Each structure stands twice: as structure tokens, then as C-alpha cells.
């Protein structure tokens, strides 16, 4: 949209499948909630302090 990129889908579940192999206890862990997904097209991350 203009210069904006809005994420529509997620790969979270795709990765969750592996986490899930140890049961709920992992699924609901904080660590699981920190799963990362790929950036939206060409671009970069930067911290503007």
C-alpha cells in the first residue's frame, strides 16, 4: 500500500509444529511466543534511537 507493507499471513504455526512435539507445556511457553518470521520483501531493519 503506497510505501507500506502489511503482513497478511503467518508462518508461526509452521514452526509451532516442531515446538508442539513436546506438548502444551512448550506451546504456551514465553519462548514459543517469541518466534520470528521473515521480513516483508526487500528492505532492512534499523533501530532509530
Amino acid at each position: 500500500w503506497q510505501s507500506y507493507r502489511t503482513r497478511l499471513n503467518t508462518l508461526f504455526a509452521r514452526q509451532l509444529v516442531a515446538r508442539a512435539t513436546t506438548g502444551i507445556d512448550t506451546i504456551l511457553s514465553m519462548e514459543t511466543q517469541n518466534i520470528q518470521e521473515p521480513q516483508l520483501g526487500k528492505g532492512f531493519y534499523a533501530t532509530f534511537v
Binding site: R14, V17, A18, A20, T21
Partner: protein
């Protein structure tokens, strides 16, 4: 694949060309979290 159990298999379909020949297809399926299959 990705810790999920999948089955991968080959099937043969008999098709009239008369003469007979066969089509080959590969199918893949997996177990879902509730134990059922897709």
C-alpha cells in the same frame, strides 16, 4: 518433515490411449495435531 509425520506414496492410474498405458501420481499426507489426518 518439520517434525511432522507425513506419508509419501506413488499411485498408478490405468488409462486408455486402442492401447493401455498408465498415469503416475505422487501423493503426500500428514497427521494433524488432533491425531486425525489431512
Amino acid at each position: 518433515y518439520k517434525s511432522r509425520l507425513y506419508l509419501l506414496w506413488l499411485e498408478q492410474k490405468e488409462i486408455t490411449k486402442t492401447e493401455t498405458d498408465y498415469r503416475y501420481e505422487l501423493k503426500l499426507a500428514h497427521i494433524r495435531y488432533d491425531g486425525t489426518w489431512n
